[PDB]
Nucleic acid binder design. Structure first.
Lengths: 215, 121, 121, 113, 50
RNA sequence: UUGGCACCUCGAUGUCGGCUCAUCGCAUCCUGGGGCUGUAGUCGGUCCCAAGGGUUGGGCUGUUCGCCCAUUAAAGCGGUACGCGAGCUGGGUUCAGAACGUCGUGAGACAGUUCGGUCCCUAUCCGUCGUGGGCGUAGGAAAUUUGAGAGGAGCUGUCCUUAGUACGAGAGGACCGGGAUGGACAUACCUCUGGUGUACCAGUUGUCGUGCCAACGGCAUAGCUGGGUAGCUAUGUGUGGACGGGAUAAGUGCUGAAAGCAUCUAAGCAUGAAGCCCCCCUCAAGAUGAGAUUUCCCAACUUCGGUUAUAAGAUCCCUCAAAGAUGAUGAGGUUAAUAGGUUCGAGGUGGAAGCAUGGUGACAUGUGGAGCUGACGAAUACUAAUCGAUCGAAGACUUAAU
């Protein structure tokens, strides 16, 4: 019943109380605010909006996403806050415990908490079937002419057609992935940094969504 | 032990000198064994005088590997050859001597007898 | 590397050496846009070497320049390493970086390649 | 060299270990708790590599025991090494002594200062 | 493989809906007075500002 | 399956075994739930429900088939033109050579056997996997979302307590419950262990060149050899198949008459499977049934009954990468740290050139953990993102009520 937003920074390691080694991920979560409260009487479902990283103010001839535009300023003016560039909703929390316009701190999570993490996987581009779907090669010798072509998705002749959901080359990576049942190792109050035991989906400087485990 | 045709040296006091892996026990489809695993093997080279003869299918346990093993504190140990010890059914060596250093992970209540005879653990 | 320019490893390094040397001699040449963005780093790191003036800096620049001779002035001849250490490095003692400027021209007939002008600031 | 990573693992670094190079004899006291009591075992060998890092630096030591070569690799900042002595400093020409694996006996002896 | 049927002129022209070229992308030079490409030098007097 | 018939195909529908493990049936090999027993217990036999997932590696043979070895919870039977050659092979069988046995006067044939012997094709249409443009969703835009639907996942072993208890002359030996740890598969990631790392560091051979020495350059697989940054990676590091509801299948019942007895059934009420619907993960409003919430912009000219450009916003064009075949997506464009350069670092290599000392010399020591360094972390406008141009609203009608 708690959640934050942050940026993945990298991977390192720390030592345990018994002297064992655990791999951890450094996550930076700062400038989290509450922007809106959706309720069943109005929206039909209870949730809260959270902004992560603050932008720059309005500009007359802005050309990039560095500066907020006019419609985004009105949304960030209802709750007194600077405009944010990452905005996500959290349905797992209880709305009445939150108030519009307050900071969300890393102190909400304590050490030993069981969490699940959501992110967007790294992109690999247009890939073949050996790497995309993990199927086997053909012989590399003995007169063979079958090395890296798709070799586990053959079809019969009665149907005179190909079925849906075949596994042939395409674009791989860039999907939404969740890793469940991770654990909080240590929280840092000065740097707004959380250490998560394990690894999380995504590249460097990517956005990550941290919640409490549902099961 | 790594495969179905890996040849192992024998580091005990018996007639067997080298063996050949025939099977890796402990599950359907398993195809790799490490230090502390039991394998089914056959004897390819032996010595004149001993209980073990050529062409016998026996069981053995793994004590040394070139690929080593990883501890849960971030340390590794890697040996210089692959070696094994022939054992009876009740986890007991059928020889009376053991040569060479022995991996430290063989004491978990299972192979205490073999660890006792080892010159260096 | 950074960008392969459609050449092998040995050809790419020989062509960057020719372009860089000819730019010191004439201080303004016309080439391709993709080529010009890789000459930048080669020439600018050579000027950094000529602003130190040590013997070791001179010998580290002789590994990239070519043995051309410049009878352009009416006075005594000089090579392209004497001009790099004598004249070009003399007038860049104040600014730190950015000794090169690139100006676009447009497509050329028969190839469609973007033509550019590269010169010393 | 990121600001955040080097600021969190700052409390794991240990400013209590000596300075050594690849190719010297060295004794490592290891706190073993294998069994029903906590004793100390000593490992003595020659340093063959040190791949760098921050808190994740490692080193490897090699020794000969009854005709079998043994490799031990520890993290430099682990809280399971009590101390380290430097018996002698060798004279090598490179940073990775992988050629010591194929040498046995007389040819595997390193010179001294 | 070879074509099984002749392609009609209706199908051929549909396929060429997107086959065309674009505008050069030009601006007026305020020294020449004549047209030039963006971010490229003028070709009349050979001047480039900014 | 072996056959019967001869209805399509001889201006051609490529024939055995293998690679592939895709898709389906249940007459179920393992797991899940039950009745009977000539079921004491631990094992069994036979019958009913159940198709969710799973159902090994080798020796012999061109083989299918079969025998054997070692395992496993188990090593199921069948269909898909005896599934699949515009996906692969070509071992066998029906081309041209040669030889043996047998038959024939003979040219030659096999009830047979042996050695050798060309596998062509640039995908038009449907179908399958990825990825864009136009129009629509009755003003024009920026974000956040509900879930009608659809797709994923679904396996299982061994140890320890209850307990050497129930049962049993004894040897043997638990259902029902509570924990620990694996095998196979899937997914994410590069901190650790390895791989690679053709603009990084070092050593060395031959032969040309920089007028000579010293020092360096080209060619010889990157000449060869020893290491190795980022990135991409497994054999490496984490995680998952958990706990639970509802209705049922075979079965077990309660209460009850037809039929004064009996009866799970006719009315009425309960319980009951790895199976069905939820619960876990991903996609999803072109869902034309086109949904919802919060923000922003809204005036001049006619009488055109309708136009107009501009507003909010988004591009053209330039500097790029965390994205990428292209195009899209994302970080920026001077009111600026987007890329190159300069200055500091990290990691890598391993002690630079010149000079001095020592040796006849090949060489060694110091100045000095020196010098050098692609991709990784910072700071700095010195260079280039100039000046500009294009598109983009003024909100139809009927009804009901305030």
């Amino acid at each position: 019943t708690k959640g934050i937003l942050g940026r993945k920074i990298g991977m390192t390691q720390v030592f345990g109380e018994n002297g064992e080694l655990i791999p951890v991920t450094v996550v930076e979560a700062k400038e989290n605010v509450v922007l809106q409260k959706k309720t069943v009487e109005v929206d039909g479902y209870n949730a809260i909006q959270v902004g992560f990283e603050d932008k720059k103010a309005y500009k007359k001839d802005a050309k990039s996403n560095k500066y907020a535009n006019k419609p985004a300023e009105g949304h960030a003016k209802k709750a007194d806050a600077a405009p944010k560039r990452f905005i996500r909703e959290f349905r797992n929390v209880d709305v009445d415990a939150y108030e519009v316009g307050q900071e969300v701190s890393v102190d909400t999570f304590v050490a030993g908490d069981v969490i699940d993490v959501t992110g967007v996987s790294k992109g690999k581009g247009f890939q073949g079937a050996i790497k995309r779907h993990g199927q086997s090669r053909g012989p590399m010798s003995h007169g063979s002419h079958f090395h890296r072509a798709p070799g586990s998705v053959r079809m019969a002749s009665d149907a005179s057609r190909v079925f849906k959901g075949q596994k042939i080359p395409g674009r791989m990576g860039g999907n939404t992935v969740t890793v469940q049942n991770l654990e909080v190792v240590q929280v840092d109050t000065e740097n707004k940094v959380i250490l998560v035991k394990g690894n999380v989906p995504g590249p460097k400087k990517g956005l990550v969504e941290i919640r409490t485990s549902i099961k | 032990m790594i495969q179905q045709e890996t040849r192992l040296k024998v580091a005990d006091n018996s007639g067997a000198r080298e063996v050949l892996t025939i099977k890796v026990l402990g599950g359907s489809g398993r195809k790799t064994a490490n230090i502390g695993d039991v394998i089914v093997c056959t004897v390819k080279n032996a010595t004149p005088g001993g209980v073990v003869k050529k062409g016998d299918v026996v069981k053995a346990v793994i004590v040394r590997t070139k690929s080593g093993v990883r501890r849960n504190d971030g340390s590794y140990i890697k040996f210089d050859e692959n070696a094994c010890v022939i054992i009876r059914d009740d986890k007991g060596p059928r020889g009376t001597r053991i040569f060479g250093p022995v991996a430290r992970e063989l004491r978990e209540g299972n192979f205490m007898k073999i660890v006792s005879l080892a010159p260096e653990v | 590397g950074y960008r392969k320019l459609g050449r092998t490893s040995d050809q790419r390094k020989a062509m960057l050496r020719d372009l860089a040397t000819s730019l010191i001699i004439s201080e303004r040449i016309e080439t391709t846009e993709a080529r010009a963005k890789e000459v930048r780093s080669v020439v600018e790191k050579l000027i950094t070497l000529g602003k130190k003036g040590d013997l070791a800096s001179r010998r580290n620049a002789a590994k990239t320049l070519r043995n051309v001779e410049i009878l352009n002035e009416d006075e005594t001849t000089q090579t392209a390493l004497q001009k790099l250490f004598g004249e070009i490095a003399e007038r860049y003692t104040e600014r730190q970086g950015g000794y090169t400027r690139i100006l676009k021209q447009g497509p050329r007939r028969g190839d469609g390649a973007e033509s550019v002008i590269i010169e010393l600031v | 060299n990121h600001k955040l990573i080097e600021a969190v693992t700052k409390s794991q670094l240990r400013t209590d270990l000596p300075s050594f190079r690849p190719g010297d004899t060295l004794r490592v006291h290891v706190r073993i708790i294998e069994g029903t009591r906590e004793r100390i075992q000593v490992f003595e060998g020659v340093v063959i590599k040190r791949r760098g890092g921050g808190v994740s630096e490692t080193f490897t030591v090699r020794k000969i025991s009854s005709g079998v070569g043994v490799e031990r690799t520890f993290p430099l900042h682990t809280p399971k090494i009590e101390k380290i002595e430097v018996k002698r400093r060798g004279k090598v020409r490179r940073a990775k002594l992988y050629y010591l694996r194929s040498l046995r006996g007389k040819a595997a002896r390193i010179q001294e200062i | 493989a070879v074509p099984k049927r002749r392609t009609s002129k209706t199908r051929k022209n549909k396929r060429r809906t997107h086959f065309k070229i674009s505008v050069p992308g030009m601006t007026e030079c305020p020294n020449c007075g004549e047209y030039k490409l963006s971010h490229r030098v003028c070709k009349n007097c050979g001047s480039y500002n900014g």
